[PDB]
Write an enzyme that holds these catalytic residues in place. Structure first.
Site, PDB file in Angstrom:
ATOM      1  N   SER A  32       0.011  15.647 -12.099  1.00 23.76           N
ATOM      2  CA  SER A  32      -0.161  15.296 -13.492  1.00 23.76           C
ATOM      3  C   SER A  32      -0.369  16.566 -14.330  1.00 23.76           C
ATOM      4  O   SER A  32      -0.936  17.548 -13.840  1.00 23.76           O
ATOM      5  CB  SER A  32      -1.353  14.344 -13.649  1.00 23.76           C
ATOM      6  OG  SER A  32      -1.684  14.095 -14.963  1.00 23.76           O
TER       7      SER A  32
ATOM      8  N   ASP B 294       0.851  -1.194   0.000  1.00 25.76           N
ATOM      9  CA  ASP B 294       0.000   0.000   0.000  1.00 25.76           C
ATOM     10  C   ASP B 294       0.883   1.239   0.000  1.00 25.76           C
ATOM     11  O   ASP B 294       1.331   1.669   1.074  1.00 25.76           O
ATOM     12  CB  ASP B 294      -0.936  -0.027   1.189  1.00 25.76           C
ATOM     13  CG  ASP B 294      -1.835   1.184   1.228  1.00 25.76           C
ATOM     14  OD1 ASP B 294      -1.958   1.877   0.205  1.00 25.76           O
ATOM     15  OD2 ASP B 294      -2.456   1.403   2.305  1.00 25.76           O
TER      16      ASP B 294
HETATM   17  C1  LIG Z   1      -8.124  -4.393   1.856  1.00 26.12           C
HETATM   18  C2  LIG Z   1      -9.058  -3.248   2.137  1.00 26.12           C
HETATM   19  C3  LIG Z   1      -9.539  -2.581   0.847  1.00 26.12           C
HETATM   20  C4  LIG Z   1     -10.215  -3.660   3.036  1.00 26.12           C
HETATM   21  N1  LIG Z   1     -10.781  -2.523   3.808  1.00 26.12           N
HETATM   22  O1  LIG Z   1      -8.236  -2.380   2.993  1.00 26.12           O
HETATM   23  C5  LIG Z   1      -7.358  -1.436   2.444  1.00 26.12           C
HETATM   24  C6  LIG Z   1      -7.706  -0.104   2.564  1.00 26.12           C
HETATM   25  C7  LIG Z   1      -6.839   0.814   2.063  1.00 26.12           C
HETATM   26  F1  LIG Z   1      -7.220   2.111   2.081  1.00 26.12           F
HETATM   27  C8  LIG Z   1      -5.646   0.502   1.460  1.00 26.12           C
HETATM   28  C9  LIG Z   1      -5.354  -0.816   1.365  1.00 26.12           C
HETATM   29  F2  LIG Z   1      -4.200  -1.184   0.731  1.00 26.12           F
HETATM   30  C10 LIG Z   1      -6.170  -1.814   1.838  1.00 26.12           C
END
Ligand SMILES: CC(C)(CN)Oc1cc(F)cc(F)c1
Length: 330
Positions: A199, A35
């Site tokens: 951008s 992430d």
């Molecule tokens: C896997 C999920 C989508 C489940 N709530 O959780 C996130 C949230 C985020 F904002 C970022 C991420 F990488 C995973």
């Protein structure tokens, strides 16, 4: 040093990508969501509330001879989708694709929100934004990248996400075979802790390019592309029967449509997102209304270049003293 790991879509829509990560001694392999929009490495664990675990692989620190409780440390995070998690902290050995960090903060979940419980394929997150966003208290912790960086051959990682296919995260090197043409680098602001850049504009389909500055973040943990309402309206106006649905929560379109491409500017360069990348399928099973992959950022306070955009490029996250982003076609 370097590392190289394959990242795999969790489902047929590319809703997220998972990457295997080795934690502890002997290794416990968990599949984490890498992430670039957050800075905590957290995992489902032997401490997670039992009712909140549904098929995930768990980290058990008591089975790792290198795990150490980070005494007094807690963490608690809320994400832009409304999800959350919290718990306590261990340090342990963490390896990604052959690259090893000792003493990495591994944030053990005691609680997770329902959307994490429901995603049986995601065992936790590995944050790759700047360490200034890490939530550990009272002593903020470093990301895996920040801990690895001085050991890496080059202080970089790259994201090469696939469309309906596996891709790659590399640490410490550029794979010059993984992209076409040249990499265009662009400035980053770290002031909000994100890989935030500007951008230079966009085009819809075969339309003329509109030169306009769009400030946003490169976020591998967001599925979709979130842009200003003007830009998004201009895109969906080219799709017969597309509309913004308050009941569904965004732009929908007839599943029978063929979508136009979307181009975004990186300096003088251009990245083209094919139309099919923008189709996120029926809004509910068997519906002929499909969910769009380009949505308004108006309710968010930031534009987000999520997976829909990033998977059309080879993306360099350059962690040099002055960070920059690089984009190449592929
Ligand atoms: C896997 C999920 C989508 C489940 N709530 O959780 C996130 C949230 C985020 F904002 C970022 C991420 F990488 C995973």
């Amino acid at each position: 040093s370097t590392g190289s790991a394959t990242t795999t879509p969790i489902d047929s829509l590319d809703d997220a990508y998972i990457t295997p990560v080795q934690i502890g001694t002997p290794a416990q392999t968990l599949n984490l969501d890498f992430d670039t929009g957050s800075s905590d490495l957290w995992v489902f664990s032997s401490e997670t509330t039992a009712s909140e675990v549904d098929g995930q692989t768990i980290y058990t620190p008591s089975k790792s001879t290198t795990a150490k409780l980070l005494s007094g440390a807690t963490w608690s995070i809320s994400y832009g989708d409304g999800s959350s998690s919290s718990g306590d902290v261990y340090t342990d050995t963490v390896s990604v694709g052959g690259l090893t960090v000792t003493g990495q903060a591994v944030e053990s979940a005691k609680k997770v929100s329902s959307s994490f419980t429901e995603d049986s394929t995601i065992d936790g997150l590995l944050g790759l934004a700047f360490s200034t966003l890490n939530t550990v208290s009272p002593t903020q912790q470093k990301t895996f990248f920040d801990n690895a960086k001085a050991s890496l051959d080059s202080p970089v990682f790259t994201a090469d996400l696939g469309y309906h296919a596996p891709g790659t995260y590399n640490f410490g090197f550029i794979d010059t075979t993984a992209y076409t043409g040249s990499i265009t680098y662009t400035a980053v602001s770290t002031k909000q802790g994100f890989w935030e850049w500007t951008s230079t504009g966009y085009a819809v389909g075969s339309g003329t390019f509109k030169s306009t500055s769009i400030d946003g973040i490169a976020d591998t943990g967001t599925t979709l592309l979130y842009l200003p309402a003007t830009v998004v309206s201009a895109y969906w106006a080219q799709v017969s029967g597309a509309k913004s649905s308050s009941s569904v929560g965004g732009y929908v379109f007839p599943c029978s449509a063929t979508l136009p491409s979307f181009t975004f500017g990186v300096g003088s360069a251009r990245i083209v997102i094919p139309g099919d990348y923008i189709d996120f399928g029926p809004i509910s099973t068997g519906s002929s209304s499909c969910f769009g992959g380009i949505q308004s950022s108006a309710g968010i306070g930031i534009n987000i270049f999520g997976d829909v955009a990033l998977k059309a490029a080879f993306v360099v996250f350059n962690g040099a003293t002055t960070p920059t982003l690089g984009f190449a076609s592929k």
